[PDB]
Amino acid sequence: STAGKVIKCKAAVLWEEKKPFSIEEVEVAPPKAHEVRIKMVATGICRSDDHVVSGTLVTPLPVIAGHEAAGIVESIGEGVTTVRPGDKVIPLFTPQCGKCRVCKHPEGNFCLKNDLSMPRGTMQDGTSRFTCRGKPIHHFLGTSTFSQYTVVDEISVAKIDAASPLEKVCLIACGFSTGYGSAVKVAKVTQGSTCAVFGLGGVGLSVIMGCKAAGAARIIGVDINKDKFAKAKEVGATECVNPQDYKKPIQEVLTEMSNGGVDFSFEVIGRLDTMVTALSCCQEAYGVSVIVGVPPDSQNLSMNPMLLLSGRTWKGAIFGGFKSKDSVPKLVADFMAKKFALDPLITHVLPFEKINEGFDLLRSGESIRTILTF
Amino acid sequence: STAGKVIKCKAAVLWEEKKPFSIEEVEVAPPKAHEVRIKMVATGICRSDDHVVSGTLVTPLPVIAGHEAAGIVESIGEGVTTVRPGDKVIPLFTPQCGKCRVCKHPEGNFCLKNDLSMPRGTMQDGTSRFTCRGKPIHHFLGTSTFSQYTVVDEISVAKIDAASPLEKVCLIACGFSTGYGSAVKVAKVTQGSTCAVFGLGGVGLSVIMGCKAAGAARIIGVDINKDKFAKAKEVGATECVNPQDYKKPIQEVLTEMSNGGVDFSFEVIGRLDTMVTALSCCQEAYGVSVIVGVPPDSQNLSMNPMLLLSGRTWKGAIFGGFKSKDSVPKLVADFMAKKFALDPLITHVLPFEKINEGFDLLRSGESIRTILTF
Ligand SMILES: NC(=O)c1ccc[n+]([C@@H]2O[C@H](COP(=O)([O-])OP(=O)([O-])OC[C@H]3O[C@@H](n4cnc5c(N)[nH+]cnc54)[C@H](O)[C@@H]3O)[C@@H](O)[C@H]2O)c1
Ligand SMILES: NC(=O)c1ccc[n+]([C@@H]2O[C@H](COP(=O)([O-])OP(=O)([O-])OC[C@H]3O[C@@H](n4cnc5c(N)[nH+]cnc54)[C@H](O)[C@@H]3O)[C@@H](O)[C@H]2O)c1
Ligand SMILES: OCc1c(F)c(F)c(F)c(F)c1F
Ligand SMILES: OCc1c(F)c(F)c(F)c(F)c1F
Ligand SMILES: [Zn+2]
Ligand SMILES: [Zn+2]
Ligand SMILES: [Zn+2]
Ligand SMILES: [Zn+2]
């Protein structure tokens, strides 16, 4: 048995920015009250994890990163009621405490217990469950999925279907749900509409999926890497454009293509310039633009507010707007019921030990999602 | 008797920025096909007219400004079907052509025939109906209401109730409808919500009226002129704050006052800094901020897109989001049935000949709306 005992296990520790992960032994404390310790099964590599490496996202280091995963409960702390040992679970990088003003709001999902806004890199109680070479190691978003075992707060875990294939449904933990929800929930894409999707990675592809599910008539994929276009068309893009092919700015191109601007645009990259471009390419009176990409830390964009005064709507969201604990189990049920596909997002499957190789595939442009298997 | 003939009449001509209006004779050509010539009865002084004088808003000069007015049709050009001589009418500074993609859209109002985005200062046909000292004079927003007679395109005029009091309902041509609609239509303020309204002039007071009509529980007025607070409370503000009273930035003050951010905020001034402050003070996960104020020409704001990524919605609108020709007659009918009040906005009445005094009253801080009578 491991319950109630420290587990020594393998994890990918990030000791400093812009270096490879170090795959080594860590100690994982048992769960305290209202905590859950999880044996990981599969985790995706999301660009947001790479942002921690690159310094685009600032979070305390050293850290066990990883936030897009699924596993099996090994043990529960006192007072846990929502999962039990042996349950398949998804860690929730956006918690759902159920008690804060946001959780109580019909349209809110960015629970005030989150560790995104002002990251502490700890459990809810302000401490860590991880040590490595005698040193405390920070958590990431209350999840820390790049480890054979993690400990998460109860509000940051959802029980999912016991028959779920974890090597697929781990994508519901971030990139699928984010993109899909950004389209169907946050933008509320309409039937017959024209959409523009900037960035054709795992998240942007999931946005296309959502736009197609919502009945859009046209879905224009935008990426500087034309190798991304074939898969974008496979999941619903009607046209793809590479800004580098044009002498004019792509907002002008998109405005012309859509005979005066698109209905819905999505920024799914993380650049200030493409956030402004994506807003501009939506129709000036009734267009909607949704920011999904994560921009570099502490940088402001510049824009002309006449873009909004004419009638545009500009919004952003975390995790597709989904209230995380309510939504994740239903998303996995819907996957099980064949309501959407995840295989189109999965280009590589590697052992966890090849995490660095997985990141190199992302950075080179060659992968969509690599799934790491423990 | 005047039908088909040039009319000589008095108008307020703006020959140069930052100068008084010149009340002097102009020649008003008869209406061409699908044009309407109107004898003005009353016009308000909106801060946007002052923006033309100050160069905040750039439109070709020399110009006959004025856009918040009502009058009586003197004559119609060939092919006009929607008004007749003797009808009471409101010129529509936002046209409604009824044929463009925006007019056809359920939520659009910024008709593509507008002369706001890239002002030409002409009729729809690219020419002017005004001569002064033998020189052609620009129109403004297709309305040019600072004249005893104007000529407007048919798509820029609405027939209103024959029993309407024109010296009141002129405010439905801009400031009331803009503010009221910004709350009820654009923001869609909810019952029991907390609102913050930046700027307590005629438009911001009309925002407050709309928030109260929508059932808001708290409506916090924000103005640097505390003399504006009493009227704001009369029309529904539950409390008023002056940023100059506080050591801390007002977005922090309002976030504290609202126990974590407001539901709905409105920028009703026209400053880049308050547009960003108003966004920031709405709750980060589900707040909505509406830009109403007109920014200084060609200037960009700077903001951190994390404010949107967490879940905020940022939007703007012209004319409260109302489809102008459909909505203005209904608003007049509702006013006649006492569904809202206009007198709280009217602080001063002057003859048209005293237009400069009316602008002095606005610039000093003393007035909300001065109504000029022809
Ligand atoms: N809001 C959320 O909750 C949330 C969730 C998941 C991911 N993200 C962010 O979403 C973004 C996309 O994530 P991902 O899909 O995993 O990343 P990704 O797989 O790197 O995809 C990004 C795509 O953008 C393309 N691209 C790069 N620069 C440009 C450009 N200038 N113009 C057009 N295309 C360009 C690039 O070729 C790539 O295909 C990242 O910034 C993530 O951090 C946010
Ligand atoms: N979107 C539209 O369709 C539309 C329609 C009508 C008016 N407008 C614009 O809306 C704005 C307000 O018009 P109005 O009500 O006629 O003008 P107004 O009467 O000048 O009211 C503006 C108020 O803002 C206050 N103010 C100025 N600076 C600050 C500050 N830093 N912080 C807080 N309050 C401040 C000021 O004291 C005044 O009471 C102007 O920019 C107009 O051009 C837009
Ligand atoms: O990919 C999801 C994701 C985000 F959307 C963030 F905004 C963020 F800060 C982060 F760390 C993250 F993982
Ligand atoms: O006050 C209404 C109003 C506006 F909202 C503008 F954006 C504008 F350019 C203008 F000239 C105007 F009069
Ligand atoms: Zn919560
Ligand atoms: Zn992610
Ligand atoms: Zn139109
Ligand atoms: Zn106005």
Numbering used by the authors:
A (entry chain B), B (entry chain A): 1 to 374
What does the paper say about this structure?
Horse liver alcohol dehydrogenase catalyzes hydrogen transfer with quantum-mechanical tunneling that involves fast motions in the active site. The catalytic and coenzyme-binding domains are connected by a hinge region that was identified by comparing the structure of the open conformation of the apoenzyme with the closed holoenzyme, where a rotation of about 10° closes the cleft between the domains where the substrates bind. The O atoms of the alcohols are ligated to the catalytic zinc at a distance expected for a zinc alkoxide (1.97 Å) and participate in a low-barrier hydrogen bond (2.52 Å) to the hydroxyl group of Ser48 in the proton-relay system.
The G173A mutant enzyme was also studied because the substitution in the hinge region could affect the conformational change, even though the steady-state kinetic constants are very similar to those for the wild-type enzyme and the X-ray structure shows that the methyl group of Ala173 is accommodated in a pre-existing cavity. In the present study, the temperature dependence of B factors was determined by X-ray crystallography of three ternary complexes of horse liver alcohol dehydrogenase from 25 to 85 K with a helium cryostat and from 100 to 150 K with a nitrogen cryostat. The mounting stems were stabilized with expoxy glue for the G173A ADH crystals, but this did not seem to affect the mosaicity or the B factors as a function of temperature in the different cryostreams. In contrast, crystallization with fluorinated alcohols inhibits the reduction of NAD+ to NADH, and the NAD+ and the alcohols in the complexes are positioned appropriately for direct hydride transfer, with the pro-R hydrogen of the methylene C atom pointing towards C4N of the nicotinamide ring of the coenzyme at a distance of 3.4–3.5 Å. The B factors for the crystals with PFB were larger than those with TFE, suggesting that the crystal quality is a factor.
